[PDB]
Amino acid sequence: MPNFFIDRPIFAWVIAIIIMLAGGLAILKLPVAQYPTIAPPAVTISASYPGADAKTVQDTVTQVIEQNMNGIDNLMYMSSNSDSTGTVQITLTFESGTDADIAQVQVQNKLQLAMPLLPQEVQQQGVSVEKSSSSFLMVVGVINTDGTMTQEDISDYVAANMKDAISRTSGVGDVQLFGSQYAMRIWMNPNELNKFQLTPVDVITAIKAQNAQVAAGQLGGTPPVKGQQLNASIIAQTRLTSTEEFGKILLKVNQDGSRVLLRDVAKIELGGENYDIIAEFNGQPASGLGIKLATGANALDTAAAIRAELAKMEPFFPSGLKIVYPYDTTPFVKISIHEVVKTLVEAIILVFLVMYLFLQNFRATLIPTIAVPVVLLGTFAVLAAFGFSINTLTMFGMVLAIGLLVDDAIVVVENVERVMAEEGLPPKEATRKSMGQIQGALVGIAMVLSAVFVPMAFFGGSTGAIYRQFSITIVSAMALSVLVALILTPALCATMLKPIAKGDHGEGKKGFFGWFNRMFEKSTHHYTDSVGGILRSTGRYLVLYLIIVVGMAYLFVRLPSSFLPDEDQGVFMTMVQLPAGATQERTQKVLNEVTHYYLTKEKNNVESVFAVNGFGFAGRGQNTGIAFVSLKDWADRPGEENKVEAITMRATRAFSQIKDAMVFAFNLPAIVELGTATGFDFELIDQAGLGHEKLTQARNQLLAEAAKHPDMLTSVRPNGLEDTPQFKIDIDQEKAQALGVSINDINTTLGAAWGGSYVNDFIDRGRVKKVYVMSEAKYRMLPDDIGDWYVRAADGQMVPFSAFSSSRWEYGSPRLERYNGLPSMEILGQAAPGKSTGEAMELMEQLASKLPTGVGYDWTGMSYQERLSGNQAPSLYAISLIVVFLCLAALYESWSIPFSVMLVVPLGVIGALLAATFRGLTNDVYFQVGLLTTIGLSAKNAILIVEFAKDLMDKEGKGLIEATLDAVRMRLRPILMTSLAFILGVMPLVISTGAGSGAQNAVGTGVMGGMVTATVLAIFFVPVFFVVVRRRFS
Amino acid sequence: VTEGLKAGDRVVISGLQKVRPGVQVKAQEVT
């Protein structure tokens, strides 16, 4: 094949042009996103039961939903969260790889069969299914800087004149609103209701009757009488469209003209649907929008379009409004693209410089510069054809594979140049001989790299996708590079080389070149005689090999393991949990204190604090609170003392003094879609039907037991809310009936006075909005106030609510959790800074084994993924080992020679482990990928050396020692050149300061250690293995 | 409160979450 294309340079040029065109077309159209679909598909069902405690929502709503959601295939695990506010959330997480667009239909259809089995209020509110594993492209906050608009006004303005336009641009998927639009609130007044002899049911009936739409029909009906010529539409009563119209609703009119109006008994205003969440941006009331990227869309273009559309609206922005972007993900993608371009340019310049330094010929230097971009475009085209995207992992694989492309180019060019120098033949025949000698080795190493990288893509779960991106990119790059080396490069060696005379290797000239050649030749002679001397003996270095092996094993065992390193994303969360029974006022005070601290003592680091009151990751309620703190750009935060870790450590140290609140601060995981906390999630599940008190006592005992080992477990905290006092009202049914009061009236009054009822819909400024009915604050705020409400009996008299009702106190849980259909509770927390996660998991399992009988344990979230390393058992590494053994035995006919090649594998793993231990990084996915790359490079060097030695031994009559020494003398310049190129090209990865530098640091350190140690300890060791294998198996 | 509390007693108002029975504490009056 290579000699075939040598005589036809333009055939190779045509193939290159086709590949370049394919790469350009691929780069023209390709989705761009921060991360691929890494998290497993998840569907969340949300339902609302206004003014209902946790128990009512749990038994009457989510029980029926959970019962009727059985039979869904590919279901991994289900969780359920009820609340005292009245919201229930059921999250179903499926297996990885399934089509979510069908699972959503399945769960929705199964839910629609249980709709008539739910109470009426939840049906009127409505339930909604959605996909929670989508991640937020950006959040757009809108704030008021004068004090006119409130949260409700801002939310309605966004819902009316911002949501549609922002949703109707290009590339935008789901758009979520963090507020609620307007709603006509009707605040009763018990004094006025008693004055006119009315009850809330009368107001509800009047609103239902006087705020309806009637199908009037049509003038000149559908069957017309003979001789009709007029036809029109009749417009009868319609929905009320203003507060002044709602205030004129009649409630009681006598025959003499006396009337009672709704405004005479209640206050009508325009408010929100629920006053449960208060959002303040830097101390000002604010609302927000969440924009998610649609599938198969460009992130940067969508962001630019969103920014332009938002900047269009300022002339029409009313009053004082400001638009801010607390959190967006585009800078990471821009940084990734910039790093890719920088690495490509640096590699090209570096390889040109090193080729000029060594080969001294410009025509030799120019050959790879017109070959590496061809392979890059081919990789782009193949990756586009397969169905991948431009993530932050594929480009990392490309910057990793640049070294492989450079290695192939260096090998081919150096071999042809040395053949020409030592043979005297001109470029044509020298290229023919070199290609004929090296084609088998090239095919063998391509097959070896494919065999070592493909099985990594067969992992399951999130790790499966993370490995899949790198594996696909690497194998595509290797295949394209070897195809290019077979087709395009031999033509280049045929045409663009100068046939210089033998012996003119720069020794005829002085300066840097001749002198450098002098020490290079002297060092080559020294190395050759040294390796000959060491090869004279065999058993002296077997003990060194065993020492290296045992040291590598000890380092592998000692090195801690984790899942994925933390990164400085510029955003971190702060959580506030007040004691049980705390109201909104104290939470607002604590949030104000936190905001003041952040904006006063960290002015040079933070940029804005988006405080949210009433909602927390643990559980919604008037007891918790959250705050998303965003930092300035990484350019303005120099040093390691101004990163996320130091900032959050100082923040929690300072917040430890905040009384009446346990304020914590933490950093969100690098992949935001998978989980919300950086630590493991552990779940205790009741099985023997103990109840709730036993479960709580067991959880407290386990927490105390785990807190007694402050060496591997840190920040072990519950994820729920503790039990709270509750008010119990008991109505004397027979007393109420005796007095003449119907039970229905009492129940309706109690449910519409303190809980609030949703009655009808109305048209406001050209849109549909609900109307809500509830008492006016001061009459529903203390227990004694329950005596202020009056109910009409049959006789027409009004009886007070305190004449037939009592009251008492109780204890109840404000948040009930369920896992897989059983009551359960969750403990979430990280591990020690100096130990592996798996050891903490094992110790937590051992601690849970000591629990009282009847309580089981389980994992969820990333922990479950960490428990999916059963495929990471040697059952897969061994498969790869046998596959590469078979490939090596097939490349050259021997069942024993590949042992020498495999013996070089530990010599790079030892260096990778040394670098990891020196830097202190843990064993994670990126380090594993770098280790595999180093193993592949060492195997490539071993393949080249062994193949050259075997060819010299077989084709000619050279003896074992003589052929081995000649081969190792011959394969010295390419190895050193490739090692120098790789080591110098991976400098920025190790030296990277910030901007998502954790993965870069880990991979660069692993690559540096592996490459340096393999280059140092392979030239001296591979010949020993070769000669030992040949003599022992002679 | 009708019974249980006497004149001159001290009742904690803040720091309840971070405190536990039978622990020495620094008590300060708040306004």
Binding site: K659, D660 | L5, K6, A7, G8, D9, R10, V11, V12, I13, S14, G15, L16, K18, V19, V23, Q24, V25, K26, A27, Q28, E29, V30
Partner: peptide, 15 residues
């Protein structure tokens, strides 16, 4: 370290 608490003083008064 030593935990600190904010405490109130109980004194009778007519209402």
């Amino acid at each position: 370290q030593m935990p600190a608490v904010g405490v109130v003083t109980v004194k009778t008064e007519p209402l």
